[PDB]
Amino acid sequence: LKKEFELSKLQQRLGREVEEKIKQTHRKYLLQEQLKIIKKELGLEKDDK
Amino acid sequence: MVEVENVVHEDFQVTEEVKALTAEIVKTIRDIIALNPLYRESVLQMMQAGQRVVDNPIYLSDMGAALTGAESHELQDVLEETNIPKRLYKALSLLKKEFELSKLQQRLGREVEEKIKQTHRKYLLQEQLKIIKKELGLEKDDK
Amino acid sequence: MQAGQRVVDNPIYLSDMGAALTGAESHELQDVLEETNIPKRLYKALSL
Amino acid sequence: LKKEFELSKLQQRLGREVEEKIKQTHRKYLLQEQLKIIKKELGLEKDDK
Amino acid sequence: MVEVENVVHEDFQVTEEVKALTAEIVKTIRDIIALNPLYRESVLQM
Amino acid sequence: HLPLIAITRNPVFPRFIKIIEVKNKKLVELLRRKVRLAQPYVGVFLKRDDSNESDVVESLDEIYHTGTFAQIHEMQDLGDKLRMIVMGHRRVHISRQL
């Protein structure tokens, strides 16, 4: 149980560290994703101002 | 006033496969009371064709044809018919004739309501778009 | 209960359950019961 | 998978948020509507036009 | 045009902790189809 | 050596589960006399043309020669006082049912 849990623990920590290093991708990228979601959600042609 | 019980009711001696049309009449009645509930459906469970308690089939066919909403004249017309399959044919015809209208009304109701849902749901999407554009698309504050 | 499972260890019982769907009067079934041979009842059933 | 998963989970949270805003709208309308009916029930009150 | 099935697939002999990642791959697939349902879930049980 | 059962417009195709609910209350006496026996059972026959309750008990040639013995499952008696379950399990052609 100790060794198997230590394997799960080292993997969970390694995955948390890789996941944190992937979260390092800036928030501009996230807002850009939502921006593309806005561009492909409805007709782009606003033609207001 | 003079009257006489001239209730003709000829039926074939072999009574095994003759009740199968009755089975279709009760299946149409089950579909009419399930898709167009008029009365409770417990009465259909009380008087079944599998209980062998139908001592008077003519009465059972009339009670089943009574759920139809066809005008009274049609009932008189069914009584004018003398043969047994003709009245069964007419009772089924009355049932289907009502059934088409019922199905039209039901389809129309669900369709029209879904149109209302597609109306307001697209408005919810437009509201989310505005709110997210009126909030996330700012630098410090609008005012 | 399918025929592709090969779990119909007693076919006569399955054939009787399938022959019950026929609307022939009970007497006719008794007539089918008089038959001893299997193809005679199968042919009569197909005719039915 | 995680990169897609983050956006998906974000969209799910965003959707529930707009829906909860609709609920916060209408639930308070149920309370205020009850308030109105009780305020209308107190005889002849509330200066009219 | 000349071609060859150069489907590289190297794997370590010790295959004990290498399937531990598989558990996370299927857990991520279950979370992708559970929190953001795209396809039916009967294929995952088959 | 039991009286014939009153099918009363209920066909029991071989290997086809069926329920029998006779209106008469005399067959329940036979149902209560079989409860102390170790193994519970019932036999099944079919009636001939022109059903008649007086003929089921008067003569025994009316019934056809084929018969189908089977085992009882369980009594219920929800509405009537005679709600037996029947089955077509073992077909038989008795040499002489009388």
Which chains have 3 or more CB–CB distances shorter than 8 Å to chain B?
A: A, C, D, F
A12 has a chain E CB within 8 A of its CB = no
F26 has a chain C CB within 8 A of its CB = no
Q: At what angle do helices A2-23 and E20-35 cross, to 10 degrees?
A: 50
C-alpha dist (Å) from residue B54 to B61, F9, F57: 10, 10, 23
CA D47 to chain centre: 29
- Give me the residue label for tokens 């022109």: F50
Cα dihedral B85, B88, B93, B98, rounded to 10, equals: 180
Buried b (16+ CB within 10 A) or exposed e, F23-34: eeeebbeebeee
User: Of B35, B61, B40, which Cα lies nearest the Cα of B49?
Assistant: B61
Cα dihedral B12, B13, B17, B22, rounded to 10, equals: 50
Give the contacts of E20 (CB within 8 A, at least 6 positions apart).
A7, A8, A11
Q: Do C29 and F15 touch (CB under 8 A)?
A: no
Write the DSSP assignment of F6-26 as a string of letters: ---S----TT--EEE--S-SS
Tokens of C46: 């197909």
Give the distance from residue B35's alpha carbon to the nearest chain D alpha carbon, in angstroms.
33
CA B96 to chain centre: 8
Q: Are C16 and F16 in contact (CB under 8 A)?
A: yes
Write out the H or E segment, with its range, that includes residue B118.
helix B84-135
List chain F residues with CB under 8 Å of C26: 11, 46
The maximal CA–CA distance of chain F, rounded, in angstroms, is: 38
Residue of C nearest to B23 (CA): C23
A37 has a chain D CB within 8 A of its CB = yes
Q: Are D2 and E28 in contact (CB under 8 A)?
A: yes
Tokens of B122: 């697209």
Write out the H or E segment, with its range, that includes residue D9.
helix D2-40
3-state secondary structure of C24: coil
Q: Are B51 and F83 in contact (CB under 8 A)?
A: no
List chain B residues with CB under 8 Å of C25: 14-17
Residue of F nearest to B52 (CA): F9
Integer Cα distance of A5 and C43 in angstroms: 70
User: Of D17, D20, C19, which Cα lies nearest the Cα of F14?
Assistant: C19
DSSP state of B66: T
List chain B residues with CB under 8 Å of C24: 16-17
Beta-ladder partners of F84: F20
CA E26 to chain centre: 7
Q: Do C16 and F14 touch (CB under 8 A)?
A: yes
Quickly count: other Cβ atoms within 10 Å of residue B25's Cβ: 20
Q: Are D8 and E32 in contact (CB under 8 A)?
A: yes
Tokens of B106: 């039901």
Residue of C nearest to F91 (CA): C33
**Are β-strands F66-71 and F90-93 bridged in parallel, bridged antiparallel, or unpaired?**
antiparallel
User: Of B10, B29, B1, which Cα lies nearest the Cα of B96?
Assistant: B29
Angle at F29 between CA F27 and CA F35, to 5 degrees: 110
Q: Do C16 and F88 touch (CB under 8 A)?
A: yes
Q: Do D22 and B124 touch (CB under 8 A)?
A: yes
- Phi then psi for E33, rounded to 5 degrees? -85, -15
Q: Name the structure determination technique.
A: cryo-EM
C-alpha dist (Å) from residue B29 to B39, B53, B74: 11, 19, 18
F48 has a chain C CB within 8 A of its CB = yes
B46 has a chain A CB within 8 A of its CB = no
What's this structure's resolution in Å? 12.0
Beta-ladder partners of F41: F71
Integer Cα distance of B128 and B123 in angstroms: 9
- Give me the residue label for tokens 């965003």: D14
Measure CB to CB from residue A22 to each of D2, D7, D10 and give the nearest one. D2
- Give me the residue label for tokens 């799910």: D12
Q: Backbone breaks in chain A (C–N > 2.5 Å) follow which residues?
A: none
Integer Cα distance of B4 and B114 in angstroms: 58
User: Of A23, B143, C27, which Cα lies nearest the Cα of D5?
Assistant: A23
Beta-ladder partners of F67: F92
List chain B residues with CB under 8 Å of C28: 16
Handedness of CA E31, E32, E36, E39 (dihedral sign): negative
3-state secondary structure of E15: coil
Tokens of D2: 């995680």
Integer Cα distance of F42 and D10 in angstroms: 68
F vs B contact (3+ beta-carbon pairs below 8 A) = yes
**3-state SS of E2-21?**
CCCCCCCCCCCCCCCCCCHH
- Phi then psi for F70, rounded to 5 degrees? -160, 170
Handedness of CA E5, E10, E13, E19 (dihedral sign): negative
Quickly count: other Cβ atoms within 10 Å of residue A32's Cβ: 11
User: Of B37, B95, B41, which Cα lies nearest the Cα of B65?
Assistant: B95
- Give me the residue label for tokens 């991520």: E28
Which chains have 3 or more CB–CB distances shorter than 8 Å to chain A?
A: B, D, E
Give the contacts of B17 (CB within 8 A, at least 6 positions apart).
C23, C24, C25
Amino acid at A16: R
Q: Are B91 and B78 in contact (CB under 8 A)?
A: yes
- Phi then psi for F18, rounded to 5 degrees? -145, 160
List chain B residues with CB under 8 Å of A34: 132, 136
Q: Are F31 and F82 in contact (CB under 8 A)?
A: yes
Q: Are A15 and E24 in contact (CB under 8 A)?
A: yes
Give the contacts of C32 (CB within 8 A, at least 6 positions apart).
C19, C41, C44, C45, C48
**Cα atoms in the Cβ-side hemisphere of radius 13 Å centred on B13:** 4
**Choosing among A5, A11, A22, which should be mutated to test the E contact, i.e. which has the most E CBs within 10 A?**
A11
User: What spatial distance separates the first Cα and last Cα of chain D, rounded to whole Å?
Assistant: 63
Residue of B nearest to D16 (CA): B128
Integer Cα distance of B124 and F64 in angstroms: 74
**3-state SS of F56-89?**
HHHCCCCCCCEEEEEECCCCCCCCCCCCEEECCC
